[PDB]
């Protein structure tokens, strides 16, 4: 139905809900194929980074995780279904806390290091396909629910003004709890569109540039921390694409950043996190078909452009 990567989203003809045991058999098929793919992942591994206590313990939840969903026989009924989504949410809550658990363990192993890029590949790699199983798994259970305006989690009318209003709310009171104040963010462009569209890496892509945003804006007017500049944010609609422009005035990225800001672990800084805001935001949406580009204006501020596929035709 929906596509994404090699990923289907099934649109289910409800009915008598048979359209929920196609998509239980599918998730069933799918989800041991892409956790193998990590363990191989986790065995080619440098060694020495590899042995680490943490690193070794996400290893361990991923073979885990595949063996109970190898021993879950083949979905025959709505009994069987049913408790293949007791199986699933128990792996979506035990894997909760693993980018975490990943940062941790990589941020020691390359003080002990190997092959520059190897670990980048190694993150990207992970955590996509970590996002990739999520909306699959969150998907087939969200079609048991009847929430107005969605198909499983896929929201047929998404306003991407709204969603992004949302995440200002959450970003501004991180920003006014640590600083006392918050930019105000103004929105502009095609702030009326409405259309088809998954808001699940929106969710975590746009909270994270916020959060850059509004903190680059405080840490830069330090002597008025009550009068900042407002962020602004450009909506750009068209039928290939969701193009969402954050331009802040909050000094822009140094030269002497440019460079490091899209690797995982570098930071300047909690509120910022641990340095994995942007390199991840930017592996999710080139997953997803789409981009994230910066644009530095040294001793201005910065513009991030986020672009994000269409579902699977155009739209307005
Ligand atoms: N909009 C921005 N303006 C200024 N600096 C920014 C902006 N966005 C990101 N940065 C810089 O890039 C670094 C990397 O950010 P990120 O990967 O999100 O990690 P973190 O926020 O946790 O440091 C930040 O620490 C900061 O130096
Ligand atoms: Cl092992
Ligand atoms: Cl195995
Ligand atoms: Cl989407
Ligand atoms: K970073
Ligand atoms: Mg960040
Ligand atoms: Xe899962
Ligand atoms: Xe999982």
């Not at 462009?189 to 405080?218: C, Q, S, W």
Request: charged fraction near 25%.
């Amino acid at each position: 139905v929906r596509l994404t990567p090699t990923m289907m989203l099934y649109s289910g003809r409800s009915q008598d809900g048979s359209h929920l045991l196609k998509s239980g058999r599918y998730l069933q098929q799918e989800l041991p194929v892409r956790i193998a793919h990590r363990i191989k992942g986790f065995r080619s591994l440098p060694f020495i980074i590899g042995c680490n206590p943490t690193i070794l313990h996400v290893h361990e939840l991923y073979i885990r995780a595949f063996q109970k969903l190898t021993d879950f026989p083949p979905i025959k009924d709505q009994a069987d279904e049913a408790q293949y989504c007791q199986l699933v949410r128990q792996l979506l809550d035990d894997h909760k806390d693993v980018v975490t658990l990943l940062a941790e363990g990589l941020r020691e192993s390359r003080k002990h290091i190997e092959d520059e890029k190897l670990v980048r590949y190694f993150l990207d790699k992970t955590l996509t396909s970590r996002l990739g199983i999520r909306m699959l798994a969150t998907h087939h259970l969200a079609l048991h629910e009847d929430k107005p305006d969605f198909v499983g989690i896929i929201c047929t009318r998404l306003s991407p003004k709204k969603i992004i209003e949302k995440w200002v709310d959450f970003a501004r009171r991180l920003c006014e709890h640590k600083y006392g104040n918050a930019p105000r963010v103004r929105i502009n462009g095609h702030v009326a569109a409405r259309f088809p569209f998954i808001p699940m890496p929106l969710d975590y892509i746009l909270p994270e540039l916020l959060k850059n945003a509004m903190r680059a804006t405080m840490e830069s007017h330090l002597d008025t921390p009550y009068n900042v500049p407002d962020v602004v944010i450009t909506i750009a609609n068209n039928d290939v694409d969701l193009i969402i422009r954050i331009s802040d005035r909050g000094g822009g990225i140094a030269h002497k950043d440019l460079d490091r800001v899209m690797d995982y672990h570098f930071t300047t800084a909690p509120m910022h996190g641990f340095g994995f805001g942007l390199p991840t935001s930017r592996a999710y949406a080139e997953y997803l078909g789409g981009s994230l580009q910066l644009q530095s204006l040294q001793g201005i501020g910065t513009d991030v452009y986020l672009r994000l596929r269409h579902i699977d035709g155009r739209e307005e």
